[PDB]
Amino acid sequence: RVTVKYDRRELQRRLDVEKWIDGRLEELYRGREADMPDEVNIDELLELESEEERSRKIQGLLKSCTNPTENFVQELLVKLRGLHK
Known part of the structure; x- marks a missing residue:
């Protein structure tokens, strides 16, 4: 989808919402x-x-x-619970 980095808190959670993009965003939005x-x-x-x-x-x-x-x-x-942004 479209969400990289995200907010903070519950990062063991956002860590899954930090990897899904780091690789996808890595290219799905690399220069983006x-x-x-x-x-x-x-x-x-x-x-x-x-x-x-x-x-x-x-x-x-x-x-x-x-x-x-x-x-x-x-x-x-796993991230929507962080801060929603």
């Missing part, structure tokens, strides 16, 4: 490290009762850079 933020619906959509509608909005959020994103949205999960 500043073109994608870690503060979108990924967090709320993560708290949605749906299944992929959460990724549907996050998918159009960063676009191809989002492409298939199920393990990346899962990380948002």
